[PDB]
Paper text:
In this report we identified that aaNAT5b is a SAT enzyme in the yellow fever mosquito Ae. aegypti. Although aaNAT5b shares only 8% sequence identity with human SAT, they have similar biochemical function, i.e. both acetylate spermine. Structurally, they both have motifs A and B, which are characteristics of N-acyltransferase superfamily proteins and an acetyl-CoA binding sequence folding similar for the cofactor binding.
In an effort to investigate the structure-function relationship of mosquito SAT enzyme and the substrate selectivity, efforts were made to crystallize its native enzyme and to soak them with its substrates or substrate analogues to determine its complex structure. After extensive optimizations, X-ray diffraction data was collected from the crystal of aaNAT5b soaked with hydrazine. The overall architecture of the structure is the same as in our previous report, with RMSD values of 0.1 to 0.5 Å between chains. However, a disulphide bond between residue 183 and residue 213 was found in the structure and it links two β strands (β7 and β6). In addition, residues 1–5 were modeled in the new complex structure, whereas they were not modeled in the previously reported structure because of the poor electron density in the region. All the test molecules are docked in the active center. Spermine interacts with Asp166, Val129, His130, Ser52, Asp48, Tyr28, Glu32 and Thr168 by hydrongen bonding and Tyr29, Phe51, Ile34, Trp101, Leu108, Val129, Ile131, Leu132, Gly165, Phe167, and Ser172 with hydrophobic interactions. Agmatine, spermidine, histamine, hexamethylenediamine, and putrescine share similar binding residues with spimine, but the enzyme has less interacting residues with them.
Residue numbers in the entry: 1 to 217
């Protein structure tokens, strides 16, 4: 229902912080398998949001915009990862505002440690897509692929040698593979236990497996 060249992909500017916040609220957090599988509340927290938004000033937040409608219709958030990150995430978890964000941090740390992208390929760091979300209303415009391809092209231009992500739905994994990413590690979300032996995520079968997938750039 929209002219296809009315769709613009670009880096979000710092001054657009609030519109990034808005798209994350509307189309990302309500559908993210990790977030919504959590057994003590499905909504996201402020410390989760603060993390996502910290990347806007770094210039690695990519938006899809309907320029006619002057509206964000897609978003992807990425950042560097490097050895040492998982331990630092666990440390932040001990002091963060919510138990939920602390619990998710520890999950993400496990995903990152297990994947070991930097170790596996001999890198000092890699580019990791934290978030990839598309407004369902704008299906049929290949937005997911375009957002991911944009992050690939961008990180390559910034001198990163690998891009990764944790792909938490069967669709997002298929997209990743389509663009040449190989899934090198995985985790059954239902089977994840923290260091207290507790089961903190209870997913629908659509979000049953999380695959970390990587592509050399």
């Amino acid at each position: 229902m929209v002219a296809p060249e009315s769709i613009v992909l670009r880096v979000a500017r710092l001054d657009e912080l609030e519109q990034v916040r808005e798209i994350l609220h509307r189309i990302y957090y309500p559908e993210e398998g990790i977030t919504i599988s959590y057994v003590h509340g499905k909504s996201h927290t402020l410390d989760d949001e603060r993390f996502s938004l910290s990347f806007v000033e770094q210039g690695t937040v990519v938006v899809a915009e309907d320029s006619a409608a002057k509206k964000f219709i897609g978003v992807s958030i990425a950042g560097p990862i490097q050895p040492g990150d998982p331990d630092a995430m666990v440390e932040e978890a001990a002091t963060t505002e919510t138990k939920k964000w602390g619990d998710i941090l520890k999950l993400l740390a496990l995903l990152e440690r297990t994947a070991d992208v930097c170790g596996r390929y001999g890198l000092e760091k890699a580019y990791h897509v934290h978030i990839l979300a598309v407004d369902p209303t704008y299906r049929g415009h290949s937005l997911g692929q375009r957002l991911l391809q944009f992050q690939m092209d961008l990180s390559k231009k910034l001198g990163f040698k690998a891009i990764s992500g944790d792909f938490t739905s069967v669709f997002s994994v298929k997209l990743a593979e389509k663009l040449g990413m190989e899934c090198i590690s995985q985790l059954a979300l239902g089977d994840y236990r923290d260091e207290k032996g507790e089961k903190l995520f209870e997913p629908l079968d659509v979000h049953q497996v999380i695959k970390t997938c990587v592509k050399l750039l």
